[model samples]
Target: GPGSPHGNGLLYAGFNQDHGCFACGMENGFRVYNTDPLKEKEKQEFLEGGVGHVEMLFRCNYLALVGGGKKKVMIWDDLKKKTVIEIEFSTEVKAVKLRRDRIVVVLDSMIKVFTFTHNPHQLHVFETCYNPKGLCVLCPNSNNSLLAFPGTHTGHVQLVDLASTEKPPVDIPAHEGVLSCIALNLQGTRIATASEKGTLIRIFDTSSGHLIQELRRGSQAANIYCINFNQDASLICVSSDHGTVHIFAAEDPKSKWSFSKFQVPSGSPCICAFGTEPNAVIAICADGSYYKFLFNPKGECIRDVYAQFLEM
Candidate 1:
């Protein structure tokens, strides 16, 4: 069960005021919970058969998944409480996303887009792309459609308006090394990326696809595995393979984004997501452990999270 156990992604849905949902993918397939401390209750249980990966959108009331030697995409309707749709493909699927009315499927070296039927929930695959390690939907604004990808194996990113496929992919050049993770703020104005090579983080304009700011970390020489935008989209947090977590203002993604390190048990940090309650930042570590810290607008960890000032 410990084999690659932490890659299981955790997400806190910001809308519909659900206080977020908790789900884990493992031997039992997928497990969903209401996450409220008072409830701590399981809401749904679906078997994944064997090895699998999951991605959920709590606000849209949708869950998308691909696994178990299946060359297709599955969608679950949270509102209706049932398996509502499935799209078939010939190859193993790597990622599945429900963007608006479109079902985006990523396979080995290809991307497929489909339209879902309103009645019986049938899907029609209309187009495909053979781009390598290339495929990400850019929902810059509701009136437009764009696809963004990493630039030539470098840290750079490229944006291609799906509506005008003829136009060249706009390159959002990042620094060196593989860009392990990226995120766009809620307002859709800023995008942040962290590298496997350096502690340096970069932010760009979502509308112009141009570099906006650069963020640097401490001297610890650790690799950051996850980066995120705070609730107001005014701050960004970067957590390394170690449990160290840092916060940077959205306006200055560069400018030495401040930091806060959680007391990890002992292991590499795999993935991370941000939680906000007025002025507090809730950091969820890789082992499903959590650490809470308070920060002023200046991006400083102003208080000791634990009762004792120092672990004597």
Candidate 2:
């Protein structure tokens, strides 16, 4: 989901940094849903305009939005029903990320970081590869504020220590093609990467850049939409173009839990993230559907709830 609406009229759907809630962008503004068991928390369709990107900073009132195919960002105060500030760019942006203290905007070949305030200041910027998919992940821990994104080389990932400016990024050769997805665990200790090939997922130690484990999605390739680690970092979940959610054990990659019965209809692109509850995974699809799956120790998953939240 980029600058236009999908077949189901949803533009984008992604979880917040804490994975506590997810925001959906649509042809008529956007809505935010609380996870665990997907519930409507807030809905805003300002002027009946479209929003293609919606990035939330936890449950805070502040959010970032991109709408009307404009090459800019709108810092929204959702409670007040208006934008507090706007950050425009020379080119169309791929993604916008929000944090408590900063706002990161991802473009085609560059990344911009700005302070979070009424009169926001540009903090720093970084050079990244052609990131059409806008792959950038931030660590949840403020003490170790690590940022991961694509490097200059294909499939290489660069880490930036946002806490300190001088600490240069560590370029890890994670794969051989373009990066399709990247994620940092809750503690920022582990990072996951998937190439455009989408056949395998690689885990790396953030500090040392050492390969920890490799997990395969399937024998063939499929576009991966999202990769998220659970709250405690024991499990990782992924959603792909094939419409299924895959859960893998962090301790043992071979140990996986997947149930095809728990998938988005029409196999539309969707974003998947582990819920706040244990062994619970949530998916919000491009087809305007939502699914939450709960699994047991035996690697079997059952659909806990499913719904078509949008007015299809």
Candidate 3:
């Protein structure tokens, strides 16, 4: 499933055997595809089952998927294979991030941290912290980690030193306003945050916790829903309610990112997630349309993919 009529975000996973690409937990259920760069026309799509708005994880030939309405996080090994693990949780998983050693899952204002060891499938939810509305990880660096939590109407980006055992050692208020989305550079040096109010993007210096730049990309009142950083951490993309997605250079944090205002004919966009590989975007609109956009460095849309799979 891609997502629902009121859906808000989408993330693409790595390629798989059955399908060219592997996707998870949208209203479309678990969709797999053949996304190899050389085989664009050979792209394949397979349905696993559908879930609500949620994030996904793929690594080491494994896929981790959690839905927005379900209280369990399911792990599927391959594209069309059987589900391997179904991890239980407290509430509907609003947000989740899976790492080799730890898993962070969020339900509304609370965050649950888990340590898992495979084979027998043992998971230890070490801590449940009521941080904020959204719990997402920023790009991880060699020394520290960054986590973004969205408050009721505001959001805070927290910086933590993995080597330190101090409580609340991170700085609060890394960005202003009720941040709808946040992203960090891979090196953990630069950060980007956007609110749901308009096409406003905020850049911050990770180490010094300073406001580097604020860019109001489009003149229209497009409630920018998603913001993400490229793998190189030099580029940032922000998507709005109007289906417009903007890409900016992080080297000049304050400058305007040459914007792309693409529209989804079906409905208003609620959320979008940007990927580093192939420079692709997966957006979920209010009309249950998952729009895909591929762009080059010139900020030109190479191809646009949109389909209304499920209707309310």
| lDDT values for all models | 0.55, 0.80, 0.53
**What is the TM-score ranking, best to worst?**
2, 1, 3
lDDT tens digits, residue span 84-176, model 2: 898878987888887777888899998888888887798888989998878898764668778889998888999888888797788899999
The TM-score values for the models, in the order shown, are 0.74, 0.91, 0.68
Q: Which stretches of candidate 2 lie over 4 Å from their true place?
A: 1-6, 47-49, 253-262, 297-299
Best by TM-score: 2
lDDT of 3: 0.53
Pairs that clash in candidate 2: none
Candidate 1 — which residues are off by over 4 angstroms?
A: 1-19, 33-43, 68-70, 118-146, 151-153, 162-168, 219-221, 259-263, 296-312
Model 3 agreement with the true structure over 109-129: per-residue lDDT tens digits: 655555534432433232323
Candidate 1 lDDT (Cα, 0 to 1): 0.55
Q: Considering lDDT, which of the candidate structures 2 and 3 is the better prediction for this target?
A: 2
Compare candidates 1 and 2 on lDDT and give the better one. Answer: 2
**Evaluated with lDDT, which candidate comes out highest?**
2
Candidate 2 residue 175 C-alpha distance from true site, Å: 0.5
